[model samples]
Target: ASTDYWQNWTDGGGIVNAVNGSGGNYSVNWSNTGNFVVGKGWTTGSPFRTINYNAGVWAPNGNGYLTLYGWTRSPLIEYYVVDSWGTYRPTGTYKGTVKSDGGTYDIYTTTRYNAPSIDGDRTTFTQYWSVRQSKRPTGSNATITFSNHVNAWKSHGMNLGSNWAYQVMATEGYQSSGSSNVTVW
Candidate 1:
């Protein structure tokens, strides 16, 4: 069930607590977002998982973008996943440290980008078969359609694969963190 997720993601200063019945909506207040984890069931452990609108960034917080922002997914074998925040288009998939204001996103396909990111600070992970670009969800009565992802992958000369696994989304906060109200129906 996607209910108890908040109870599972606790660590460091990221205190996630259930904001509604069973566990649909959640709230996050952290001095360090880097120390939080979405936890077990959130991952398929391999690369093949069918995820609902179960994770990632959403609005009503400091995430200010053009209209709104979301970094969510449900990927399969040979598909692309992202690093921090991800979105998609027809030119291929993209993943990078993005600017929430719609101000910036290092987008590219077949092009490898890198920088020195250290733990607690930042560090780059060299692993292919991971990518991201597009509409995903979280928050109060918020959600993401799985097909948006399916269609995006197909546009990239790829289709949902059988090696489905993992669902990891992230965002870099200039400040450690604060509190945000979330409700999922």
Candidate 2:
């Protein structure tokens, strides 16, 4: 049976939790003076596809982002499709821009050497990013054509692995605070 997911993580100085709702829906709350991530998705063998998502209440304080986040093992890639964000935006090596879902996203590639990864801690990997130029409409729902971003990354020489790990629509806080209620289908 397909089920929803609620994952929460913290580096000790923050508190966060995600509660599963019906289908692919979830509610999350967090207060962080450190790093935290809380969100929903599937127990993926595969969760890669186009998705429609609605955020009834999306709010973030300090530095954070609302993103489609995931990891791939073979090529050791961590990826994000950032829809919205807070005070700070993540930046890296400029890779160009991709247009999708009626908006343009700036592409970037970041290398994490001997850092924590899905494969394991202290493993080197790369982070692929597509950050929206303009944040998604406030208090709005929209479709995310994930494949378009993937194809665009590939075209830019950013290849993902054959084995995909868990992928989630996530709210990540870095020394920040935030809350959200979202549904995806």
Candidate 3:
């Protein structure tokens, strides 16, 4: 079973601040004062020179832009064996767009995999049979979809590929005060 994780930035401050009370003249100057503030804030080069705060933290200075620095993993593929068996893996990076407060952010991730054949040529390798990529909207409960473009099994492959399948393994509806019970696909 896959566990669902929720990130709560509602209470967290938007502007990550780093202040220097005691340091050399090079430390507390205009250049150094805003160095530690991570999310977004006023700088000497920006258009809106005034310090603006929004949504529990300092709003992004000038244009409202948010940067996410971290790593992402491949989605778990659950395969079922019937008359045949196969393997599944991500062909390239996962791509997506994020929308917050009228601002949008584009994101992407990458992965790879190889699965063994399920038919008479079990010992014989299938080699590279398929590859896929996925996309999702950031900071929103948006649906994610995948696309595959390699099908050695069929003489005539589908436009979207018939071999591909997906299901929302789990989901939770929102409420006024809290979240609803999780539903399985």
lDDT of 2 by residue, 28-94 (tens): 7777558767667755625347767788878887787888888888878888999988898888999
**TM-score (C-alpha) between model 2 and the true structure:** 0.91
Where does candidate 3 clash, by residue pair?
93-109, 93-110, 94-109
* lDDT digits (tens) for residues 64-91 of candidate 1: 1111112222321222333223122223
* Local distance difference test values of all predictions, in order: 0.32, 0.80, 0.20
- How far is 21's C-alpha from truth in model 3 (Å)? 56
> TM per model?
0.39, 0.91, 0.18
Mind giving the per-residue lDDT tens digits that candidate 3 earns over 1-185?
Answer: 22122211122323322222121100111111112212221111111111111111212222211211111112122221011011212222323443322233222222223522222222332122122122222222221111111121122321221232222211111111111111110
Off by over 4 Å in 2: 1-3, 45-48
Ranking of all predicted structures according to TM-score, beginning with the best and ending with the worst: 2, 1, 3
Candidate 2: residue 49 Cα off by (Å): 0.5
Question: Model 1 reaches what TM-score against the true structure?
Answer: 0.39
- The total of clashing pairs for model 2 equals 0
**Model 3 quality (TM-score):** 0.18
Error of 1 at 98 (Å): 17
Steric clash pairs (candidate 2) = none
Candidate 1 at residue 83, lDDT?
25
For every model shown, the clashing-pair count is 20, 0, 3
Better of 2 and 3 by lDDT: 2
